[PDB]
Amino acid sequence: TSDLIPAPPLSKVPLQQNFQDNQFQGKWYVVGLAGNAILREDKDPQKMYATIYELKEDKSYNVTSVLFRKKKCDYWIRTFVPGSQPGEFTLGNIKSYPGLTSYLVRVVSTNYNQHAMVFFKKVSQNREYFKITLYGRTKELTSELKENFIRFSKSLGLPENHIVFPVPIDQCID
Ligand code: CM1
């Protein structure tokens, strides 16, 4: 028995116009994180992690996230395959993940060399989850980019306690 804020209709999620797959590659730090399964937790606050996007020759992305947990670096790898329009993707090899029936990625906005906001929605064990990441080329972003991320998250039904700014760290992600 779970309770979740509903996924917003896709019409409320903008798409980055003219998406350039080659320029979005590289490392992105997660300076902000929001979603219906994201919960602030002041006692053990979320540490910053990073996600690296590499264009494979077939134009799919090989995606690697790295987090510092239990004194070690944990790597998670997935494949994002170009979806219905430039800037949208679905998950490769969905079959290999137990209980996952849909996964959508939409790049909301980016200038490529400093910041990005990406929307994700998936259905896992029949529950509909969504999150928005505020990506930075550096671990810090202006208070202006942060507020904007907050406004957008709220615009999708999320309250403040479902929006966090992971704390910068040096382990694993540099
Ligand atoms: C292990 C534990 C905590 C943790 O560290 N999880 C991180 C792992 C690294 C990437 C950030 N992230 O996004 Fe997870 O991805 C989501 C995608 C769409 C909507 C919601 C989520 C989501 N993930 C968090 C989550 O808690 N997932 C579950 C289920 C875990 C298995 C399914 N999930 O949930 C995955 C699967 C694989 C790694 C994805 C790699 C790429 C990129 C995205 C990014 O930049 O955040 O990501 C979980 O048990 O997580 C909360 O919402 C996490 O889950």
Could you characterize what this model shows?
By secondary structure, the chain is mainly beta. The protein has a single domain (1-174), classed as Beta Barrel (Lipocalin), CATH 2.40.128. The chain has helices at residues 21-24, 143-154, and strands at residues 26-35, 50-55, 61-69, 72-82, 88-91, 100-110, 115-124, 127-136, 163-164. A hairpin with a 2-residue loop joins strand 3 (61-69) and strand 4. The longest helix is centred in the C-terminal third of the chain and has 12 residues, at 143-154. The protein starts with 20 loop residues before the first helix and ends in a 10-residue tail after the last strand. The protein binds carboxymycobactin S.
Nearest-angstrom radius of gyration? Answer: 15 Å
Range of strand content:
35-45%
Strand order of the largest sheet: 1-2-3-4-5-6-7-8
Query: How many strand units?
Result: 9
Count of discrete alpha- or pi-helical segments spanning 4 or more residues: 2
Report on the biggest sheet.
8 strands, antiparallel, barrel
Multimeric status of the protein? monomer
Can you tell me the CATH architecture? Beta Barrel
Encode the helix/strand succession as letters: HEEEEEEEEHE
CATH topology: Lipocalin
Task: Give a topology summary.
Elements: H1 21-24, E1 26-35, E2 50-55, E3 61-69, E4 72-82, E5 88-91, E6 100-110, E7 115-124, E8 127-136, H2 143-154, E9 163-164
Antiparallel strand pairs: 1-2, 1-8, 1-9, 2-3, 3-4, 4-5, 5-6, 6-7, 7-8
GO biological process, one term: extrinsic apoptotic signaling pathway in absence of ligand
Keywords: Apoptosis, Cytoplasmic vesicle, Disulfide bond, Glycoprotein, Immunity, Innate immunity, Ion transport, Iron, Iron transport, Pyrrolidone carboxylic acid, Secreted, Signal, Transport
Pfam family, one: Lipocalin
